[PDB]
Subunit: 334 residues, 4 copies
């Protein structure tokens, strides 16, 4: 009884969500909409990936349909989201991943096309936010338009939940070293509002502002107004790292922090929060499906009330698998 | 009696042409047109460069004009080239560098605005092509719309001219290892016609097709139909290299080739064609104003009639300085 | 009846040969010698790889032995190759991969330790060279010390064999765009003999001299004295590309070249020489086991007697799998 | 009355110290010692630089001496530091930059050769540490062997001095995003003690441990035991950034922090501590001689008592110029 999923947009997030859905098998993709990509170019884009390698399976085109592993997928080329016929394609849930329809009113145009529920794979101004393993039990089936937050928020949340539940985070500041994305420029180029983001991504470090640490306070209501941070965008390909500097209410040695993080990663947060003690680097987490992996040896503690914790996350795969897991939990709640 | 130059477009080529014109002092920039860049963003773009460093001088904004080294520059934000008032700004020559007006009819819209002559900084389908030091004596002042060719053609033409004049190139094939440009994508992205150019520029090698070796036959009419080639776009920043494999009519040892190339680089082609015998690499030619520099130690000869020659070129600076030099020679011919 | 293989040196070639031997299952690794790597560091090196990802299997240390997939491996830390006890470890063949014992006299010290045959994974001055699929039928079991040539030679050989057999290569030059290796320097550093190789590998293009195209004439005796070339070392990670410019004796259109290369890649050279018509880039050949893959769309022909052909090769995996395949064919000939 | 300086070692630090000494003119280099670099290779190394470009001046070899700008330099090739004849070469101060003689006993071997004072360009276990602009007034001429600390400490010190003097740092944590160095490996390689440092520098992020934040407490005695941190080594070329998260005793808005940092950068710490409000990136600080530049727009404050400050530093140039400035202040105190 798997749900039927349509995907709006065939960018990086849409292709990786389709790849995660075909790898895991939790949901079924039945429709893809993109106005600027044709069918053969869709075959070429899905088959070959510079970061995650070739697709393990068969992908081709037949009768105007995209056939992946023997499953045909209807292709739409509509630009207006209210004109996409999701209903006759059989799609029940719609993943909005273009990054330009993030409000409730803009993403609600998909409901006119026959879709039941819309999941935004981006931060939203007014839609409710859900992070898997932290507050996903708060979903109550009467919400039609929700938001899965972002990759950085998905990495920071579970981690901050365990530390807050065991030791009481008083205040903290986060820094993330982030890999390049699609919005950056190969060489110095014109960025309208963010002047730093228009500089050459290959040659530069590029400090940037982010709101994921503030969105943790939306995800965890007890931490509202206690977290903030910024980011650095370094010239790597896929893997990012989060560094959280926090002050604790209760005394906590580093071995106690390691023990409670390992215990959380084993039982309750299995598959969402990881734990390692090896001498790992960034490329050791390529195509890793965890939201965040705690690096025990990389962190440092100044005293019993002031620590800095290090975590890793694949901002492409882990996030797409969280979209699939959230969609599966949504389908189980009907 | 320096000519007055307007620049259409403030991309990489336009900014580097303005920088070369202010560094050399051969011409005077009096006007810049760009519809998507405002004045303060123009100040920020011209002041800071990731590749060539900070501008040696003063740049600011005063009374709606861009003041560089005390010289004010009028700024236009028109989109239609026929609506730009080049005449009241005092601009006599116009450098068309946007890359979208390359035909004679499209680039002739600048003549309606009061411009006298238009120089296209791109290959053109029907405008006459000129390369400095090779065929620039063929300019006869009755041509209004001409094309300066491209960086690769400017690198290949002087070396091919010297080798053909001394030994008689029978046929040849060229390969260029090229640095990234602006049209590439930081990560796998959607390229309409060129599917290979949409892949991630940081992770890939990306073979590509080019018409520069064919345009050498337009520049040198005796070599028509004797040259062709392709290119590779590797993840470096600025400097490219040309590798020419050719068959000669007359016997030629490698020392004779080195002698005639050095003698050409000293007297006739001084400043256009360089010569080195040191153990150089690509970053040794950053901000070098030569069109091409012959690497004596990097080439190899199989026999007396079959050689492979290696040359270096900064595809940003050398080319912009050639645009300025062509404009100066055009102004001297009036 | 698989042969027992010892590996001398745990560098990049030795680890990739061990990985290919455990992935394919054609031979059995029973011993590894390295004087500067201990057992736990060997576990860490074999488990984690930046280029080819994590090892698919189990690797650990037990009772002073390296246990991979339940198979224990004896570890030696001897420096003198004549003092390694290969015989009591059960090793019959020895892969010499340190890169410092390449002559027959230096690599013959392994025969004193009880080894039967020595395979050098490097070009050799006086040992016979063999390339799989080209001249591997010339092995006659009375040779104790042979050489498997190099990755570039393994890519160029089969390709040049097909073109020479079908159209008669008169003369040809080769250029290879090569990924960075271990001998390069992260930043400008001191290289004793090769001054260009001491420059910073991340920032530079670095022309270099190579002898693989000359070693093709040793592998194919009819092409002796007809091939030469050089190389460029660009800042990528794993995949290299070979560009061969040649003159043919018989007339050959490009479709005929494509047809004979595809026919060779299907029947006789299956698994050694590949063929593609897609719009591929370098990262599409990561962890590909082919020696060379012909890129049909990337090449160009000037006329019927002067062509340039493009081929891809993973210089790490394909070469190690060729070492394993040569060892298996050697074991079958006893 | 400039002092005579000998340099031990011609690595990155030694060459950049020689370049800074010839650019600034504060001291005179009279001797260079290196056992593995000959004279012509020294000419090649000093003339060409991938990061900072070609040397602005003349460098050649004459009569066994290295002639830079008409100044001859004696060359030694001794390995034992006690066997170098610094005295007959006229050298009064000696910069120990090889990185292997950092204790007082090991670096005191240069005093047997006729040197007066030894400056170690590295952190030292028992030699006194001095940072220019912070505690350089504590030098008292009776010390023979001192240490100039490290680049990270030189960036963090002045900044922490101003914040501690104006607002009273209670405790703080530091993270630095550092460019690749010489100790890293182009590809996965064998690192004896630091297993993470042996991984491929081009592909990885590589968390690492550092002691510069602890050495600030040696430089500023009131901050002893209040600072600690770690580092990340990203694949860029030259410029690093320091990220300091601290808790303040007195209330401080961000505008007050900006005001006191700008006032410190103008008057007392001119040339040592910089200040900017532009939208800068890392390559804007290439060849910048400041120890640290405060980025006003990149930092963030959670409340009045918990801030995160961002600063930039060229870890190659700024540090070498600090070595020259410390040597000049040492020479003025005689």
């Amino acid at each position: 009884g798997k749900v039927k999923v349509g995907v709006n947009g065939f960018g990086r997030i849409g292709r990786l969500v389709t790849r995660a859905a075909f790898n895991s098998g939790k949901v079924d993709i039945v429709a893809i909409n993109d106005p600027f990509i044709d069918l053969n170019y869709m075959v070429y884009m899905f088959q070959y990936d510079s970061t995650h390698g070739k697709f393990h399976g068969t992908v081709k085109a037949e009768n105007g349909k995209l056939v992946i592993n023997g499953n045909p997928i209807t292709i739409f080329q509509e630009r207006d989201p209210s004109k996409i016929k999701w209903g006759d394609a059989g799609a029940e849930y719609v993943v909005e991943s273009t990054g330009v329809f993030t409000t409730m009113e803009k993403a609600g145009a998909h409901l006119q096309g026959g879709a039941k529920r819309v999941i935004i794979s981006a931060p939203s101004a007014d839609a409710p936010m859900f992070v898997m393993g932290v507050n996903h039990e708060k979903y109550d089936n009467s919400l039609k338009i929700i938001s899965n937050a972002s990759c950085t928020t998905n990495c920071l949340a579970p981690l901050a939940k365990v530390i807050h539940d065991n030791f009481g985070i008083v205040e903290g500041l986060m820094t993330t070293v982030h890999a390049i994305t699609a919005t950056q420029k190969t060489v110095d180029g014109p960025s309208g509002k963010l002047w730093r983001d228009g500089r050459g991504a290959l040659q530069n470090i590029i400090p940037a502002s982010t709101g994921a640490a503030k969105a943790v306070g939306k995800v965890i209501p007890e931490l509202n107004g206690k977290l903030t941070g910024m980011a650095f965008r370094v010239p790597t390909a896929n893997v990012s790292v989060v560094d959280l500097t926090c002050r604790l209410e209760k005394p906590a040695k580093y071995d106690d922090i390691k023990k409670v993080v390992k215990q959380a990663s084993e039982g309750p947060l299995k598959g969402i929060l990881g734990y390692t003690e090896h001498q790992v680097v960034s490329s050791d987490f390529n195509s890793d499906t965890h939201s965040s992996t705690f690096d025990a040896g990389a962190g440092i503690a100044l005293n019993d009330h002031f620590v800095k914790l290090i975590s890793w996350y694949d901002n492409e795969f882990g996030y797409s698998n969280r979209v699939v897991d959230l969609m599966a939990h949504m389908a189980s709640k009907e």
